[PDB]
Amino acid sequence: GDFVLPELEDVRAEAATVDTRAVLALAEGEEPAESRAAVALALWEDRSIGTAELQAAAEARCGARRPRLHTFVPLYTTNYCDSECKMCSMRKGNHRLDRKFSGRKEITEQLEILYHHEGVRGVGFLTGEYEDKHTRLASAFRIGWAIRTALDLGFERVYFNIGSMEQDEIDVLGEWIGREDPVTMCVFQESYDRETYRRFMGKTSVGVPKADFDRRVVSFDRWLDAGYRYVNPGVLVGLHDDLSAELVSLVAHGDHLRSRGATADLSVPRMRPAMKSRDTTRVGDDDYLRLMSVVAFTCPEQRLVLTTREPQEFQDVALGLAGVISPGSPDVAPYRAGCEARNDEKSSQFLVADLRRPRHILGRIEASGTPVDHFVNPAGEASR
Amino acid sequence: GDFVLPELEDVRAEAATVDTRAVLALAEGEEPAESRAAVALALWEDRSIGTAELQAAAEARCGARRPRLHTFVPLYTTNYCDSECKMCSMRKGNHRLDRKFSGRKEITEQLEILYHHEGVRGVGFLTGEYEDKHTRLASAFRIGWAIRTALDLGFERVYFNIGSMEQDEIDVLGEWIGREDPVTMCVFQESYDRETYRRFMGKTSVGVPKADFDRRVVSFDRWLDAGYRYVNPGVLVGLHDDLSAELVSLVAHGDHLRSRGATADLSVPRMRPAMKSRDTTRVGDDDYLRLMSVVAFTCPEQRLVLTTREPQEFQDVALGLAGVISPGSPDVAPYRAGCEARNDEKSSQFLVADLRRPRHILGRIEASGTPVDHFVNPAGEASR
Ligand SMILES: Nc1ncnc2c1ncn2[C@@H]1O[C@H](CSCC[C@H](N)C(=O)O)[C@@H](O)[C@H]1O
Ligand SMILES: Nc1ncnc2c1ncn2[C@@H]1O[C@H](CSCC[C@H](N)C(=O)O)[C@@H](O)[C@H]1O
Ligand SMILES: N[C@@H](Cc1c[nH]c2ccccc12)C(=O)O
Ligand SMILES: N[C@@H](Cc1c[nH]c2ccccc12)C(=O)O
Ligand code: SF4
Numbered sequence: 122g123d124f125v126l127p128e129l130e131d132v133r134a135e136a137a138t139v140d141t142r143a144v145l146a147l148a149e150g151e152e153p154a155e156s157r158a159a160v161a162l163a164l165w166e167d168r169s170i171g172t173a174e175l176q177a178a179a180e181a182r183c184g185a186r187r188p189r190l191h192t193f194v195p196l197y198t199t200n201y202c203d204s205e206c207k208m209c210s211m212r213k214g215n216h217r218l219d220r221k222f223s224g225r226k227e228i229t230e231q232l233e234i235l236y237h238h239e240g241v242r243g244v245g246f247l248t249g250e251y252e253d254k255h256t257r258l259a260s261a262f263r264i265g266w267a268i269r270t271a272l273d274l275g276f277e278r279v280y281f282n283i284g285s286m287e288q289d290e291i292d293v294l295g296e297w298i299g300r301e302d303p304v305t306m307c308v309f310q311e312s313y314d315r316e317t318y319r320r321f322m323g324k325t326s327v328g329v330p331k332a333d334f335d336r337r338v339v340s341f342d343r344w345l346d347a348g349y350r351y352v353n354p355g356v357l358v359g360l361h362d363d364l365s366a367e368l369v370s371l372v373a374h375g376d377h378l379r380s381r382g383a384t385a386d387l388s389v390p391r392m393r394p395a396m397k398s399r400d401t402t403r404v405g406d407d408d409y410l411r412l413m414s415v416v417a418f419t420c421p422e423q424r425l426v427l428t429t430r431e432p433q434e435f436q437d438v439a440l441g442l443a444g445v446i447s448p449g450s451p452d453v454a455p456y457r458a459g460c461e462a463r464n465d466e467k468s469s470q471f472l473v474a475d476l477r478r479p480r481h482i483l484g485r486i487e488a489s490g491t492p493v494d495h496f497v498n499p500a501g502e503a504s505r
Numbered sequence: 506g507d508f509v510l511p512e513l514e515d516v517r518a519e520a521a522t523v524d525t526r527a528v529l530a531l532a533e534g535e536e537p538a539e540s541r542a543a544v545a546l547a548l549w550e551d552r553s554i555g556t557a558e559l560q561a562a563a564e565a566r567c568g569a570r571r572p573r574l575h576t577f578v579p580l581y582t583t584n585y586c587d588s589e590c591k592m593c594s595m596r597k598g599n600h601r602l603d604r605k606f607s608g609r610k611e612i613t614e615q616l617e618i619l620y621h622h623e624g625v626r627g628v629g630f631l632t633g634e635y636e637d638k639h640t641r642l643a644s645a646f647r648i649g650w651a652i653r654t655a656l657d658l659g660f661e662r663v664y665f666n667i668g669s670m671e672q673d674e675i676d677v678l679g680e681w682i683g684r685e686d687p688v689t690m691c692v693f694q695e696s697y698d699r700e701t702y703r704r705f706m707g708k709t710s711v712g713v714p715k716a717d718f719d720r721r722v723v724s725f726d727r728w729l730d731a732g733y734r735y736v737n738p739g740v741l742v743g744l745h746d747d748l749s750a751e752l753v754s755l756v757a758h759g760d761h762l763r764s765r766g767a768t769a770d771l772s773v774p775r776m777r778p779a780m781k782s783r784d785t786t787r788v789g790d791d792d793y794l795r796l797m798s799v800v801a802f803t804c805p806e807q808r809l810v811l812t813t814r815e816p817q818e819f820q821d822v823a824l825g826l827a828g829v830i831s832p833g834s835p836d837v838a839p840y841r842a843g844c845e846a847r848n849d850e851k852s853s854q855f856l857v858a859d860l861r862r863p864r865h866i867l868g869r870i871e872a873s874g875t876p877v878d879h880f881v882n883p884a885g886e887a888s889r
């Protein structure tokens with residue numbers, strides 16, 4: 122019943138049998154005869170199909186999706202963490218980080234800034250992941266409170282990204298919300314390759330919570346078992362060298378979730394500068410656009426999430442592939458009325474490339490011709 | 506500015522100079538010429554004054570206090586703990602304990618049972634004490650929420666007992682309440698003797714949070730610095746062999762708090778059966794009544810707290826010395842409408858002697874002629 126990692130050799134064999142040109146010729150709303158993972162791999166490896174042509178096909182295939190875009194802004198509620206992810210500044214061993222924690226007042230103030238000054242109706246709550254059961258339950262409780270508070274304020278969509286979750290931890294968070302509430306669980310697997318995963322997230326049975334690959338990857342299944350709906354798997358582009366392996370796994374994971382009746386967003390964030398203990402792979406724009414294209418094409422009902430990790434120039438090229446645009450900063454309580462968000466190296470998870478205010482970024486997107494759901498431009502008669 | 510432990514040799518010298526008979530002859534509202542600690546020690550050591558006669562004097566001296574009694578019922582919100590107190594079942598090393606955690610729903614349900622079925626308007630929230638800063642802040646956040654929730658429900662007095670507190674942890678809890686709210690910080694020093702303290706609470710600098718004697722003992726001063734008012738120091742009777750030492754220290758601590766403008770309750774709980782890793786001293790009823798008497802006499806504006814650690818027969822004899830009566834159970838979410846509270850050895854901090862419902866105990870006290878503030882007997886027209 123839980124997600125099972127696909128056999129990469131089995132998918133490769135199936136991918137050899139798909140007609141990539143026939144696939145591209147499919148009408149919007151038509152599904153290939155082969156599995157999505159196989160089709161994605163075949164499109165990826167068929168270099169006779171240009172990335173530019175693949176991207177155009179993807180944007181066309183996802184064209185009828187409504188709304189075209191919606192948005193949420195991240196709010197890191199703390200930068201404490203018990204884990205040791207080597208590509209992340211929040212790793213416990215990073216003694217150089219200035220550890221911060223948002224209380225009731227600060228979280229509420231941040232929500233109110235986002236709602237009224239940035240004009241957004243989507244928010245995401247983030248924390249580190251913690252080792253001992255009590256801290257995990259207490260974190261779930263606090264984030265559950267934040268989610269409930271955001272919804273009561275009028276936020277129309279709430280994401281959370283607080284590490285893997287077991288059944289009792291979901292129980293604690295769930296007492297704050299209803300089964301039909303617009304709440305999305307985010308748990309990026311980072312890498313579906315167990316060896317690369319261990320290299321960056323560490324070895325198990327030593328008080329490093331995220332090292333447990335299996336607890337993490339079945340978190341969505343526990344979520345769905347509890348009766349919820351919205352999920353957000355992800356791959357961190359730059360960890361594993363073989364992107365074809367990761368796209369097969371991610372598409373397979375999304376496909377599993379879809380089969381369970383889940384609504385899934387798909388995240389493929391690319392690496393950003395941080396206080397790392399191990400360097401990573403720089404993935405070029407072309408490979409990355411090709412990755413986004415095959416995933417978006419093969420999973421047309423599952424929105425890709427694009428964030429301000431990426432510079433303005435890249436957003437301009439890739440926005441057509443996304444279903445969710447998410448501007449913001451991975452610093453703790455970084456927002457302030459009329460000011461750009463803080464992205465201090467001393468306390469942030471990583472350094473983002475685009476620090477322009479969410480309402481400017483989202484305003485320019487709307488001005489360019491694409492409406493953004495869960496964004497209410499604080500302009501004209503809608504201004505205070 | 507912070508509390509300084511009195512020199513026991515200096516107090517002993519002063520106690521030798523007080524006229525214990527003249528002290529007993531003092532009118533109610535009149536204060537001895539010597540310090541309270543010295544007077545308490547002298548009364549304690551003057552065996553020509555019987556315990557029975559000392560108790561009568563204490564009950565008389567505290568007789569004009571209004572209200573005579575008020576009440577609160579404890580609610581343990583979790584039995585997780587990071588510390589290692591050797592006389593407590595909740596010590597981290599006790600692997601036999603069934604660890605529990607109350608979420609939003611359970612805490613609220615417990616509050617509603619206490620309010621409506623037991624008819625109480627006072628509640629206390631308790632947790633273990635935790636090591637890492639994030640867990641401490643998260644615990645402070647959750648308990649702050651509970652306190653705010655209780656007050657909103659109509660509770661007129663709220664205690665909390667969640668371990669030592671630093672300035673930032675108080676900040677987090679404080680965002681839930683106002684400076685004038687009826688909220689009492691409880692931090693029982695257990696023993697003011699540093700050696701006995703180390704024997705039971707453990708040695709410092711090894712991830713055992715309560716081992717830090719000094720952080721614990723100045724928690725009230727941080728509370729008062731933040732602008733709050735109500736405090737509750739305590740001694741665990743049975744740890745230190747020399748009760749005269751502990752009563753000098755406790756009375757001195759209460760006196761310090763009083764000088765800062767604080768309103769203080771005084772707790773002298775006696776040891777109860779638990780899953781201990783070190784046995785303790787059994788203190789007889791006479792010594793214990795004498796202890797309560799000299800503390801109550803010398804600190805007439807500071808209410809002693811009497812709890813259902815003690816059996817019914819002892820409450821009957823000692824109730825006249827108390828200003829706070831606190832029935833309940835030290836199990837996690839133990840209350841249930843129409844049923845006696847749970848005190849399961851598998852999950853409780855210790856075993857209490859009196860498990861009768863709070864409303865029965867408090868009802869019998871009122872029937873006997875003593876009103877209990879913050880108790881509304883759910884009877885007659887006040888019943889649903
Ligand atoms: N250096 C970096 N650059 C860009 N993204 C990063 C990054 N380090 C981590 N991330 C991404 O940020 C995402 C959410 S922040 C992590 C939340 C939570 N502690 C968890 O690990 O589940 C992670 O899933 C990871 O993919
Ligand atoms: N075995 C036992 N019998 C009776 N009281 C006990 C006990 N063990 C601990 N206690 C008391 O219960 C009180 C509150 S429960 C402890 C709360 C918090 N973890 C803290 O230690 O500060 C403690 O202060 C202690 O004095
Ligand atoms: N890193 C999280 C939260 C997030 C959303 N948008 C962002 C922009 C910048 C930094 C972090 C974010 C995610 O990708 O879901
Ligand atoms: N032990 C805490 C809480 C408490 C109040 N009344 C009790 C009765 C039984 C057990 C615990 C309690 C205290 O003495 O303040
Ligand atoms: S990715 Fe998440 S779990 Fe890993 S170190 Fe960073 S905050 Fe902690």
Ligand code: SF4
Nearest residue numbers: 586588590593595596
């Ligand atoms: S007395 Fe408090 S701090 Fe000590 S073990 Fe028990 S719950 Fe933990």
Ligand SMILES: [Br-]
Nearest residue numbers: 188189190492
């Ligand atoms: Br649209």
Ligand SMILES: [Br-]
Nearest residue numbers: 392393394395
């Ligand atoms: Br990088």
Ligand SMILES: [Br-]
Nearest residue numbers: 242494495496
């Ligand atoms: Br909206």
Ligand SMILES: [Br-]
Nearest residue numbers: 572573574876
């Ligand atoms: Br009275």
Ligand SMILES: [Br-]
Nearest residue numbers: 776777778779
């Ligand atoms: Br005992």
Ligand SMILES: [Br-]
Nearest residue numbers: 626878879880
């Ligand atoms: Br009342």
Ligand code: NA
Nearest residue numbers: 493494496497
């Ligand atoms: Na909009």
Ligand code: NA
Nearest residue numbers: 877878880881
């Ligand atoms: Na009453």
